Design a protein around this ligand. Structure first.
Ligand SMILES: CCCCCCCCCCCCCCCCCC(=O)OCC(COC(=O)CCCCCCCCCCCCCCCCC)OC(=O)CCCCCCCCCCCCCCCCC
Ligand code: HEA
Ligand SMILES: CCCCC/C=C\C/C=C/C/C=C\C/C=C\CCCC(=O)O[C@H](COC(=O)CCCCCCCCCCCCCCCCC)COP(=O)(O)OCCN
Ligand SMILES: CCCCCC/C=C/CCCCCCCCCC(=O)O[C@H](COC(=O)CCCCCCCCCCCCCCC)COP(=O)(O)OC[C@@H](O)CO
Ligand SMILES: CCCCCCCCCCO[C@@H]1O[C@H](CO)[C@@H](O[C@H]2O[C@H](CO)[C@@H](O)[C@H](O)[C@H]2O)[C@H](O)[C@H]1O
Ligand SMILES: Cc1csc(-c2sc3ccccc3c2O)n1
Lengths: 144, 93, 57, 105, 46, 51, 79, 43, 514, 72, 82, 259, 227
């Protein structure tokens, strides 16, 4: 059980599905009954009960493969907390637009943009694909 | 003419220790690579140490780029976890 | 000149716990304190000069 | 390199050494599960009998666990291996992880 | 000799998590704040 | 025993997604940010030239 | 002589993007020819091709600076 | 990796304090400067 | 005791810790400068001032991030911590000179600060091209303080390069050949060789700019027979080796991280990884003029540098595919460090591929000095070097400190950062292709949308940075002490515990030759 | 009753080869889609635009719209 | 070169080269130099604009004299000083 | 305690004082160039000398007096010195690059020729040739010094090393004289720029190398060197040969081909 | 010019810019293909419980990892270099125009016959006429004849600038003391915009370029009227 800091130079226990038989037993110190269980293990294992067999496993190993490989719900915490802080970021952007940014130039007014759009169509801005190509000069409208 | 001291006359400190030990064919400060034995349990590699544990790096096969590192402790010979060659610590000093 | 290296080896291998830059004796401490004072005093003066130079005159 | 039959024969021989010790058992299993294969039942059989000679019931159950693990999403491999091992499991008194409840999360 | 182990191999104290918070606040905060106040400094010159 | 994610996972995911969508939709549409989208299919061109 | 001059034609001596020496060479060539034609009483009009090319190629401020320095006696090229 | 339990556990409330204090140490000084930008420009 | 340990250090671990603290503090400075950049661009118009203040911010943003954040953290920080441990050495070859390499950086940082405080700052770009950086267009002390800052940082790295090369060549176990050293050790040595060869050329270049500004030389002044293009050659002869200096230690940490969290004992194709890093370092010295495709060079020179630049993709591709081959068949542990490394592999690949686009001088005519370039290097620097730094930090933090991070918080941090960085810089491809120039404080109205999205992304990354500081606090606040670490048999740096003792390998490792 | 012996060797290598071939197939499929939706589309758009393009007529429309400094 | 003089390259051989070749060469170059010395006639001053560069005053003197200014041979931007 | 051969250095203040001296020298130069004062600069230079003296003093204490320079430590110092010289080669390479850039493509402002109009180069066969024979001769004498030291000859070591130092001083005095006598200055365009900056940095390295040789001279007087252990001399010899080769390149490029 | 929400290059106005568009399409397909393959393989490596952790032999597979990229690089270099030298091909221009960079504006010189020169400044935002483009319009446009090969010569009289027109695939650095040359051929009339492309001080963003392409006859009359 209890692993210590000054133990780092000694062989240790791990639960790894690619390292099924670790270097040491999970439990090194045996009680009186655990000592007798290990003695019984030297005889036919058919004479061992289910509980005794489970107990032998839990002395050698900490977690089973099913336990060590189990899935968790951590992704809900990770994805949800990430969306909170991304949401909190929008609060910073709202504060910046309100207290830091002044008005944008007058060229973004609706009437400027409408006249600017015609002049761009008058000079045939991007007439092959990008812009004027999407205006119908015969019907005087945006192509459908 | 002379007048220039030699290392035998004037070398001191750790330099002198390394010089005198090399003249006896000894390597207390680990300048040389030890030559391996066959590494069996009967003929293990003998690892000197001034303490009761030392880190061993095992190049399991010639030209392996991966080195296998483990603590070798005082007591019964231990085996490299990759190739199984035996190492036994010999504390001294 | 005579070879007095043995005397210097004995002085600087003396088991007194002093670091090498102070093991020569009291003169080492004086030269250290002169050096560190000029460095730290000069550094503070450079910060003053930055403060002065950071505004128009 | 070597054929499948020669690979299996090397590993059967490895685990069949009468005086195999605990280190060699762990070394064999930990090395074997590094390969891109689920070990043949005859290899597991030899490994389980090595556990018997070493009086190590728990490692025998663990070996059965890693057979299932090495199969990945191919659920049909582990029931087949257990099927082929049932005579050995009965002879030696080895309960499966399922029979012991060790397949529960 | 010097102190060894977790929390002892660093030039700052972690003995008290709240004093540490104040110090990490001053440390990283001063670095982040510095360019804004240098922006301010340059704007206030002309 | 159930850990933090078993107890609070579903709530953290649901609240976080709802808070994030709501505040970014608000910021995008309600505070006067000019995205300057394409005029194609959106703007009616207006006479610009004068005498 | 071979007129209808549009602009300075391609010159194999100066085939790259850096055209500094092209302008420099023709400016030298014109004023070297002009000096030869002035001293011997001939006609500067034979230097005309060099004049058109350097006027086409050289920035106005380059010609004006070079002209000022020829008059000051500080022009570093050989004419 | 395996580790001991926290020698000085940091409760959810304590983490809320540390997170809030950390964010405020970044946001308040810069916010102050950016809020007063016009005071700096037209001056 | 405190002054002796932290001001007079001759210990590779403590000095590494000093570098990490310095680089983290500088990372705050560089981050704030980056927000000031994107705040100016976050909506059309002006916010701060005109281009001088804006491009003093831009210039310092590059200098702080490159010379004071990435290089001290990767080379001075991880290098000093890991390299001696990974070869079983008791310390660096020159442990006292090692300390001066660090302590040259705070004064170097102070000099950069001074340049922005005096006069109107150095608004030159981190390339410091003359004549804009000359004494007529930038009269005053600002540019000279920038030059001196680079001088001190240059000396620091040059001496550090001498230290690393000597340590890696001379202080290995006698049985260990160079082909038995971990890939990170290889990446640091190669980086150190590039530093040794490139920084002296930069020092010469900027010294000639110093004398042009103050001693009436005319290296770069046509009036005296000089050439501004000469400076560009001298800078970029250092300039490209520098960007590979920035990424190579990242390459080495990625190799270790991908190998570790794939459950592998070794990376795929060790010798191929060595060959590729050595080929990348060699090729990085003969391609510099791809930063000058629009200065007026001959077509044959532009044909060579186009071809020589693109060859780098072959050794780099070997590394990318070897990392993928290391993942292949692994028992994948989805740690936060692994996520950073997986984000590195993809995002570095994207930025590398856009570099290959820029390598074509014909296409570079339209893309040079546009935000397509900014998109290229932020994908390799801000999504390569930083992700490698973040992966290395969260992987080795338990080794350096002895405490564990909160893995859930760290995964949350990665997720916020991944969204913020991609929202910031991916739309900058569109701005570049459509013709938005670099180093602009304002843009034509058509460029509004992508600049707006990009600046919003920068705020998301700010939230990640603030969360990172909290996560580090939480780890030190809770004090979860490390117990066991996996795979110590192929990760020597962990084998002395967490943290390792002040003195490690006082008795060297035992490695026989057979 | 008894279960049949499944394939037990090389499952990882077989999964890899299958999907590498899969990725190759999809790559060819994308290169065809890209040639049709991007590359050929761009060639035809420019080819169609210039086949009967009249630059003087284009200029006259621009001049009449009043955009030019040099042509009223 | 035409000196055999090979075998062990030792202190005696290199002293031989020092006094037999190296220092004699220095004496000959010293002789040669102290024969072509003596001042030559300084050339007419031409205020060329690529020479006598002044973009910032020097940080010593009056800001207009170079560091090792020689009045005899180094003219100012306005010419030789008297 | 240690069973390796490497040197664990005592904690030392000289890294900090050296770093602060660089701050003072660089801020001093800025103070001098822009604010008409030499105070910071003279403090930085003073602390720089003090740092270098005590730093290298301690290295002598650690090696000659304390014996920490095992063969492995010496091998490391060999790599360090070789790598440092390499970095110095690349530093000068940038100036040779600048010289050949300007001189192979002379701009119209020069007259389109090299040497530029109005530049009257020094005669390469007079003092520049004398300087060449001086440094080449000092390479011979320092090689005699080395072999004398290895063969245990104290007197001839000091004689050869003194001759080497005298030649280095001779070169410096000749160059100082050439600088004063030159009819062109550092402000005479790119010719004067490349000439004095390249030869000036070399002249500084000559003074540095002469100082290094003088240090070795007095250490030899005090019997510091053995016939087998004397890296301080070897490093100074490598640095001196580097100084010599750089001059040979300067002579061929700037004095001879560039005339 | 650029339009809102633009993703790619501005529409080509010159045959060379057309060539760059098709080369970019060719290269961008390869960029998409490799990054997608890398992303897919990453997901492939990460989505199986099957393991293989023993030593892997690398020789055979690295031939593939090296030959295939090498072929791809050649498939990029071939069209890239063809366009490179086609840009450099000898052409016979009928007009030479110089542009000088300044802080912060462009000046233009037409000196083939007359000494025509003028300055070109950005129209301030407060003085824009309805429908004109912020930061892009100039007072005096660069009037040029359409469908003719023009030689542009680029230099500067102070710091570095760069004369760029994306529509025509043009960008040539403006360097004092140096005369850089590029070739200009517009297939169409109209207005074509660019901006200074080398950081040059306080108004780097505010010194744009506007080309006005018109028939020869209108250019000749405009030139005469500008003397
Ligand atoms: C993946 C990219 C790098 C990482 C970034 C991750 C963040 C997510 C973004 C990422 C999500 C989208 C990823 C592909 C976007 C392609 C957009 C496009 O149509 O590009 C077109 C071209 C220009 O071509 C044209 O002229 C065609 C004009 C067609 C116009 C039609 C109008 C329709 C409107 C469409 C609006 C799109 C708005 C997009 C707005 C996007 C705002 C963020 O632009 C360019 O060249 C841009 C230069 C890109 C250079 C780097 C390539 C990296 C490829 C990695 C992908 C593999 C993994 C995928 C799977 C990815 C899974 C992660
Ligand atoms: C970490 C830093 C870093 C890295 C690694 C790179 C990597 C590369 N860079 Fe980048 N670069 C910069 C930092 C970096 N760059 C910076 C800072 C600038 C601008 C400086 C300034 O002006 O301020 C810049 C600018 C820059 C330009 C100039 C653009 C301009 O200014 O006009 C060019 C053009 O050649 C370029 C090219 C490359 C290339 C070819 C690579 C290659 O090394 C990338 C190779 C990687 C890959 C190609 C992906 C992996 C390979 C495969 C998956 C195999 C399959 C691929 C193929 C078959 C192609 N870079
Ligand atoms: C044998 C003589 C050796 C020279 C001794 C003279 C002073 C010592 C200074 C050493 C500086 C070394 C490099 C300096 C660069 C240029 C100096 C050129 C050498 C020189 O001294 O040339 C003189 C210039 O003097 C001048 O102004 C120089 C005035 C002082 C300028 C100091 C500038 C220092 C700049 C240091 C920059 C950093 C150095 C590199 C650090 C790199 C770190 C990686 C020429 O004199 P003149 O009056 O033009 O007339 C000539 C005809 N009578
Ligand atoms: C007058 C104008 C002054 C201007 C400022 C310049 C000042 C001059 C500095 C000149 C160089 C002085 C170097 C003195 C070094 C003395 C210490 C020393 O040399 O110590 C030796 C090792 O040195 C070692 O690190 C070798 C270390 C060599 C390092 C120095 C190399 C030169 C660097 C100079 C600075 C570069 C500047 C570049 C500027 C562009 C000790 O080993 P040994 O000698 O084998 O013997 C020990 C035996 O006794 C045992 O039996
Ligand atoms: C780029 C990194 C930063 C971007 C995001 C910044 C987020 C801002 C966080 C809050 O900052 C505070 O904002 C207050 C306003 O909400 C300011 O008070 C100012 O405004 C108050 C409200 O009008 C007044 O009461 C105060 O006196 C006045 O100082 C205050 O100075 C500032 O610290
Ligand atoms: C407004 C502005 C432009 S640059 C600048 C700053 S802040 C700063 C902080 C530390 C080091 C350098 C700088 C630097 O150059 N602020």
């Amino acid at each position: 059980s209890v692993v210590k800091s000054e133990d780092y130079a000694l062989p240790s226990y791990v639960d790894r599905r690619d390292y099924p038989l670790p270097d040491v037993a999970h439990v090194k110190n045996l009680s009186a009954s655990q000592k007798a269980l290990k003695e019984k293990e030297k005889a036919s294992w058919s004479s061992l009960s289910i509980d005794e067999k489970v107990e032998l496993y839990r002395l050698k190993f900490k977690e089973s493969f099913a336990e060590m490989n189990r899935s968790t719900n951590e992704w809900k915490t990770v994805v949800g907390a990430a969306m909170f802080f991304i949401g909190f970021t929008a609060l910073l952007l709202i504060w910046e637009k309100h207290y830091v940014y002044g008005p944008i130039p007058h060229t973004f007014e609706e009437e400027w943009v409408a006249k600017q759009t015609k002049r761009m169509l008058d000079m045939k801005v991007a007439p092959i694909q990008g812009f004027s190509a999407k205006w119908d000069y015969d019907k005087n409208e945006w192509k459908k | 003419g002379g007048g220039v001291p030699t290392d035998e006359e004037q070398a001191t400190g750790l330099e002198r220790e390394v010089m005198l030990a090399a003249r006896k064919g000894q390597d207390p400060y680990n300048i040389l690579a030890p030559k391996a034995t066959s590494g069996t349990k009967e003929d293990p590699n003998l690892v000197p140490s001034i303490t009761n544990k030392r880190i061993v790096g095992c190049i399991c096969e010639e030209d392996n780029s991966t080195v296998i590192w483990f603590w070798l402790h005082k007591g019964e010979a231990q085996r490299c976890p990759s190739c199984g060659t035996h190492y036994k610590l010999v504390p001294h000093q | 000149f005579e070879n007095r290296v043995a005397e210097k080896q004995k002085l600087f291998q003396e088991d007194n716990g002093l670091p090498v830059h102070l093991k020569g004796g009291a003169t080492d401490n004086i030269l250290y304190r002169v050096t560190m004072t000029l460095c730290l005093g000069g550094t503070l003066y450079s910060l003053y000069c930055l403060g002065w130079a950071s505004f128009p005159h | 390199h070597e054929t499948d039959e020669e690979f299996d024969a090397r590993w059967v021989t490895y685990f069949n050494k009468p005086d195999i010790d605990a280190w060699e058992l762990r070394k064999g299993m930990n090395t074997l599960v590094g390969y891109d294969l689920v070990p043949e039942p005859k290899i597991i059989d030899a490994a389980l009998r090595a556990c018997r000679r070493l009086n190590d019931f728990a490692s025998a159950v663990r070996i059965l666990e890693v057979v299932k693990d090495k199969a990945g999403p191919h659920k049909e491999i582990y029931p087949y291996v257990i099927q082929e091992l049932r005579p050995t499991l009965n002879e030696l008194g080895i309960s499966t992880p399922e029979e012991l409840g060790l397949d529960k999360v | 000799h010097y102190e060894e182990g977790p929390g002892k191999n660093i030039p700052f104290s972690v003995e008290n998590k709240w004093r540490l918070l104040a110090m990490m606040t001053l440390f990283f905060g001063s670095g982040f704040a510095a360019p804004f106040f240098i922006v301010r400094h340059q704007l206030l010159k002309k | 025993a159930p850990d933090f994610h078993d107890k609070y996972g579903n709530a953290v995911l649901a609240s976080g997604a709802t808070f994030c969508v709501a505040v970014w939709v608000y910021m995008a549409t309600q505070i006067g940010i000019e995205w300057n989208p394409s005029p194609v299919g959106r703007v009616t061109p207006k006479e610009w030239r004068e005498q | 002589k071979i007129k209808n001059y549009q602009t300075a034609p391609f010159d194999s001596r100066f085939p790259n993007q850096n055209q500094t020496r092209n302008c420099w060479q023709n400016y030298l060539d014109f004023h070297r020819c002009e000096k030869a034609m002035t001293a011997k009483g001939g006609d500067v009009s034979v230097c005309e091709w060099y004049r058109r090319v350097y006027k086409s190629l050289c920035p106005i401020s380059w010609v004006s600076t070079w002209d000022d320095r020829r008059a000051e006696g500080t022009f570093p090229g050989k004419i | 990796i395996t580790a001991k339990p926290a020698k000085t556990p940091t409760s959810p409330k304590e983490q809320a304090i540390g997170l809030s204090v950390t964010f405020l140490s970044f946001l308040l000084p810069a916010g102050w400067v950016l809020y007063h930008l016009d005071n700096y420009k037209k001056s | 005791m405190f002054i002796n340990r932290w001001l007079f250090s001759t210990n590779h671990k403590d000095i590494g810790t000093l570098y990490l603290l310095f680089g983290a503090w500088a990372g705050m400075v560089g981050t704030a400068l980056s927000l000031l950049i994107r705040a100016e661009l976050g909506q059309p118009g002006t916010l701060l001032g005109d281009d001088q203040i804006y491009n003093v911010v831009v210039t310092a943003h590059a200098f702080v991030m490159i010379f004071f954040m990435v290089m001290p953290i990767m080379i001075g920080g991880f290098g000093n911590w890991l390299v001696p441990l990974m070869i079983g050495a008791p310390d660096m070859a020159f442990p006292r000179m090692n300390n001066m390499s660090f302590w040259l950086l705070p004064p170097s940082f102070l000099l950069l600060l001074a340049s922005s405080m005096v006069e109107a700052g150095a608004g030159t770009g981190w390339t410091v091209y003359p004549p804009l950086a000359g004494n007529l267009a930038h009269a005053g002390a600002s540019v000279d303080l920038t030059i001196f800052s680079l001088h001190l940082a240059g000396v620091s790295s040059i001496l550090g390069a001498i230290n690393f090369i000597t340590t890696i060549i001379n202080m290995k176990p006698p049985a260990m050949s160079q082909y038995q050293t971990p890939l990170f050790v290889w990446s640091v040595m190669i980086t150190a060789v590039l530093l040794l060869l490139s920084l002296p050329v930069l020092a010469a270049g900027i010294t000639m700019l110093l004398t042009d500004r103050n001693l009436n030389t005319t290296f770069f002044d046509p009036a005296g027979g000089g050439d501004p293009i000469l400076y560009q050659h001298l800078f970029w002869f250092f300039g490209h080796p520098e960007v590979y200096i920035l990424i190579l230690p990242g390459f080495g940490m990625i190799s270790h991280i991908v190998t570790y969290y794939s459950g592998k004992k070794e990376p795929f194709g060790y010798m191929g990884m060595v060959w590729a890093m050595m080929s990348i370092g060699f090729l990085g010295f003969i391609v510099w003029a791809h930063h000058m495709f629009t200065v007026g060079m001959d077509v044959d020179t532009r044909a060579y540098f186009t071809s020589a630049t693109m060859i780098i993709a072959i050794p780099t591709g070997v590394k990318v595919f070897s990392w993928l081959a290391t993942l292949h068949g692994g028992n994948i542990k989805w740690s936060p460090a692994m996520m950073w490394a997986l984000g590195f592999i993809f995002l570095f690949t994207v930025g590398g591929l856009t570099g290959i686009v820029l390598a074509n001088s014909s296409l570079d005519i339209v893309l040079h000095d546009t935000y397509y370039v900014v998109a290229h290097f932020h994908y390799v620097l801000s999504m390569g070097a930083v992700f490698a730094i973040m992966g290395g930090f969260v992987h080795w933090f338990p080794l350096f400190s002895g405490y564990t991070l909160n893995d859930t918080w760290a995964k949350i941090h990665f997720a916020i950062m991944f969204v913020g960085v991609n929202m910031t810089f991916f739309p900058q491809h569109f701005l570049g292709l459509s013709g938005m120039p670099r180093r602009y404080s304002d843009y034509p109205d058509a460029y509004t949308m992508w600049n707006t999205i990009s600046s919003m992304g920068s705020f998301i990354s700010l939230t990640a940075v603030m969360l990172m500081v909290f996560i580090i606090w939480e780890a030190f606040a809770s004090k979860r002490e490390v117990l066991t670490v996996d795979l110590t048999t192929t990760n020597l740096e962990w084998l002395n515990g967490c943290p390792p003792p002040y003195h490690t390998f006082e008795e060297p490792t035992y490695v026989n030759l057979k | 009753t008894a279960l049949a012996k499944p394939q037990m060797r090389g499952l990882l290598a077989r999964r890899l080869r299958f999907h590498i071939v899969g990725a190759f197939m999809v790559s060819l499929g994308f290169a065809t889609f890209y040639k049709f939706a991007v590359a050929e589309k761009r060639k035809k758009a420019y080819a169609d635009f210039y086949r009967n393009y009249d630059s003087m007529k284009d200029f006259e429309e621009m001049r009449k719209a009043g955009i030019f400094q040099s042509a009223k | 070169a035409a000196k055999g003089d090979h075998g062990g390259t030792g202190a005696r051989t290199w002293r031989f080269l020092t006094f037999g070749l190296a220092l004699p060469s220095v004496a000959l170059c010293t002789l040669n130099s102290w024969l072509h010395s003596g001042h030559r006639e300084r050339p007419a001053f031409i205020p060329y604009h690529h020479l006598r560069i002044r973009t910032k005053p020097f940080s010593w003197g009056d800001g207009n004299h170079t560091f090792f200014h020689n009045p005899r041979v180094n003219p100012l931007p306005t010419g030789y000083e008297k | 305690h240690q069973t390796h051969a490497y040197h664990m250095v005592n904690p030392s203040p000289w890294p900090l004082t050296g770093a602060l001296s660089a701050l003072l020298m660089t801020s001093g130069l800025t103070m001098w160039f822009h604010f008409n004062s030499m105070t910071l600069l003279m403090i930085g230079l003073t602390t720089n000398m003090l740092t270098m003296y005590q730093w290298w003093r301690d290295v002598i204490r650690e090696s000659t007096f304390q014996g920490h320079h095992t063969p492995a430590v010496q091998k490391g110092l060999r790599y360090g010195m070789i790598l440092f010289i390499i970095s110095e080669v690349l530093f000068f390479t940038g100036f040779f690059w600048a010289f050949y850039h300007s001189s192979l493509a002379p701009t119209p402002e020069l007259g389109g020729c090299w040497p530029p109009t109005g530049i009257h180069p020094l005669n390469p066969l007079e003092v520049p040739l004398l300087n060449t024979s001086v440094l080449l001769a000092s390479g011979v004498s320092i090689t005699w010094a080395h072999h004398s030291l290895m063969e245990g000859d104290r007197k001839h070591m000091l004689q050869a090393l003194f001759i080497t130092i005298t030649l280095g001083v001779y070169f410096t005095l000749l160059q100082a004289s050439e600088y004063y006598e030159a009819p062109f200055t550092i402000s005479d365009g790119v010719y004067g720029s490349t000439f004095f900056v390249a030869t000036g940095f070399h002249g500084l390295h000559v003074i540095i190398g002469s100082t290094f040789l003088i240090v070795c001279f007095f250490r030899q007087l005090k019997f510091h060197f053995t016939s087998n252990h004397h890296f301080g001399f070897e490093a100074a010899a490598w640095y001196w040969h580097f100084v010599d080769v750089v001059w040979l390149f300067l002579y061929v490029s700037i004095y001879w081909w560039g005339s």
